Amino acid sequence: MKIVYWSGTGNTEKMAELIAKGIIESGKDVNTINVSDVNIDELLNEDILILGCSAMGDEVLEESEFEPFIEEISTKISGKKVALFGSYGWGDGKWMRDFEERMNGYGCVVVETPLIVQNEPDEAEQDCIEFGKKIAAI
Numbered sequence: 713m714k715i716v717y718w719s720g721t722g723n724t725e726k727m728a729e730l731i732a733k734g735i736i737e738s739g740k741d742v743n744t745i746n747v748s749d750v751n752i753d754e755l756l757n758e759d760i761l762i763l764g765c766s767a768m769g770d771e772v773l774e775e776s777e778f779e780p781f782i783e784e785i786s787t788k789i790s791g792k793k794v795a796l797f798g799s800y801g802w803g804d805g806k807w808m809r810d811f812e813e814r815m816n817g818y819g820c821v822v823v824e825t826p827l828i829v830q831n832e833p834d835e836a837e838q839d840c841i842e843f844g845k846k847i848a849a850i
């Protein structure tokens with residue numbers, strides 16, 4: 713499986729690692745890829761797309777790298793299963809509610825409730841691992 717993410721301070725990156733840990737514990741392999749090193753062609757062969765990005769700007773996806781990536785794959789993911797996650801700060805998840813609506817609008821099936829964690833996953837570490845285990849059971 714593959715997990716693609718963007719992280720500005722490491723919060724979402726740590727979530728990605730924990731999610732991968734859950735998938736591995738369930739007995740499956742998975743690679744974590746920073747959005748800047750993703751190969752869209754290889755990624756589209758995946759059964760499930762696991763995507764993560766922290767809340768940036770005014771409750772939007774990161775603009776210089778992550779958003780263009782989503783825009784690029786948007787026309788080629790109809791029917792694909794997706795799992796969404798990310799870290800946020802002072803808001804209450806607006807960027808994620810919009811991210812989920814967007815992916816659904818592209819025809820994707822959002823498999824689980826998106827996982828959002830405030831700042832660094834501290835107390836939420838097991839939650840991240842469990843999210844990975846849920847995706848591995850798909």
Ligand SMILES: Cc1cc2nc3c(=O)[nH]c(=O)nc-3n(C[C@H](O)[C@H](O)[C@H](O)COP(=O)(O)O)c2cc1C
Nearest residue numbers: 719720721722723724766767769771800801802803
């Ligand atoms: C420029 C900027 C804008 C942000 N905008 C938001 C926002 O609209 N709402 C929010 O909840 N957090 C916002 N945050 C806080 C980040 O989402 C939060 O610090 C998160 O933990 C960062 O995760 P990362 O290290 O994976 O990027 C913003 C952070 C930065 C640097």
